[PDB]
Amino acid sequence: ATFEIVNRCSYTVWAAASKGDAALDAGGRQLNSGESWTINVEPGTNGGKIWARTDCYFDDSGSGICKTGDCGGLLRCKRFGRPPTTLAEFSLNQYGKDYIDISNIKGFNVPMNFSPTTRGCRGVRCAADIVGQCPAKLKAPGGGCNDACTVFQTSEYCCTTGKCGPTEYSRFFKRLCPDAFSYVLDKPTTVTCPGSSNYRVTFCPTA
């Protein structure tokens, strides 16, 4: 499956793509304002994620650091990124269908639209100014808006026991972005797409 990653932000971002234990395609690449990078994700990929990283610095070997979404200090991500990270999540060819969603469970750093480029289903989006409106206690000194689990480490915010409910913090993310997961047990906003669909992830879709 092809995923065209487009940076419509006025600032540079370092796109990342991983499934947790492996890097999807190159795993990561720099995207200056306006640039598009198309990656190929193998069919059947389960638990894949794409996100943006901001304020990065890498050397000649591809090692460095980013203020948001840093993945072990590597340009080419092999693991998931450090919160806060707005997440485009997907599982492909799962019993004949594809499943996509956007999640704020690990915080928010850059606005994003995640849509199919093929017929059969609609896209999801979270482009509200969550960083600007971020509650004081969730503001990440390094940039972005942290999720409550990351900040407070409680069973309720992290839903560790699998028995949690909405919170004042999750409701903030849900208010700003109704079409994205605001907490673990949030009402699903996952979209079902035809198996083997193709997609486009656009950072800062609202220009």
Swiss-Prot record:
Coiled coil: none annotated. Pfam families: Thaumatin (PF00314). Keywords: Cytoplasmic vesicle, Disulfide bond, Signal, Taste-modifying protein. It is found in: Cytoplasmic vesicle. Disulfide bonds join 9-204, 56-66, 71-77, 121-193, 126-177, 134-145, 149-158, 159-164. Its main location: cytoplasm. Gene3D superfamilies: Thaumatin (2.60.110.10). One of its GO terms (cellular component) is cytoplasmic vesicle. InterPro entries: Osmotin/thaumatin-like_sf, Thaumatin, Thaumatin_CS. SUPFAM superfamilies: Osmotin, thaumatin-like protein. It comes from the Eukaryota. Belongs to the thaumatin family. Taste-modifying protein; intensely sweet-tasting. It is 100000 times sweeter than sucrose on a molar basis. This is Thaumatin I.
